[PDB]
Design a protein around this nucleic acid. Structure first.
Length: 180
DNA sequence: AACAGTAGCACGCTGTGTATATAATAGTGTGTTGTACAGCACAACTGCGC
């Protein structure tokens, strides 16, 4: 082994606590998009940490694109400050990470059909529909996308340890189904 | 007759469908409920006439 998964995307939610006028928000923000007809939220962005926020009239906000939990909270506080600077009585509350995505490379090809047959109740593999095997782990409850190349995607985690836990648990199985 | 330029065709590369999680919230679609409108031979009935 020796491989440890790399975090790729962190999704979080934040309650600003006050109602927002989206045209005002979009108008005053330096990096905003807002087309009511397409989606009901201002799509705001900041350069550091590089992230994207979906800002709603209710004052709720979704922050995505961060590569670390630190970066997620940091960028979230920053978006909240922007809203304040524009003039609303916003508050940075209820910061919570909802989804963590990770990925790695085991460095060997995998026999997906064998794995799907062996771990049938957790696996779903339809190569004509999507080339990767969808593995639904029980403990921890994580979803893994397994590819012939040996590249692995882990998602559905609320905490970093779950990403790490799942990979540790899957590695022996990937080894059992290697090609070379 | 030869050379240069322009147009057309073919090939290669980049971008967007499929799948995973996860939050946000008002809309859109579907289903259900309510209201309104549109071959014998003999056996029995029944029908007609006295």
């Amino acid at each position: 082994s020796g491989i440890v998964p790399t975090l790729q995307n962190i999704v979080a939610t934040v309650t600003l606590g006050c109602r927002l006028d989206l045209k005002t928000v979009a108008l005053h923000a330096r990096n905003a998009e807002y087309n009511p007809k397409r989606f009901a939220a201002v799509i705001m962005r900041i350069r550091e940490p590089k992230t994207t926020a979906l800002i709603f009239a209710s004052g709720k906000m979704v922050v995505t694109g961060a590569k670390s939990e630190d970066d997620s909270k940091l960028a979230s506080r920053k978006y909240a400050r922007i809203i304040q600077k524009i003039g609303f009585a916003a508050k940075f509350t209820d910061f919570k990470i909802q989804n963590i995505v990770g990925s790695c490379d085991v460095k060997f090809p995998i026999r997906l059909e064998g794995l799907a047959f062996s771990h049938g109740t957790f696996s779903s593999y339809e190569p004509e529909l999507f080339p990767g095997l969808i593995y639904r782990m029980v403990k921890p409850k994580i979803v893994l996308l397994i590819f012939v190349s040996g590249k692995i995607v882990l998602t559905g985690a609320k905490q970093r340890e779950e990403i790490y836990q799942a990979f540790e648990a899957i590695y022996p199985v990937l080894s059992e189904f290697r090609k070379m």
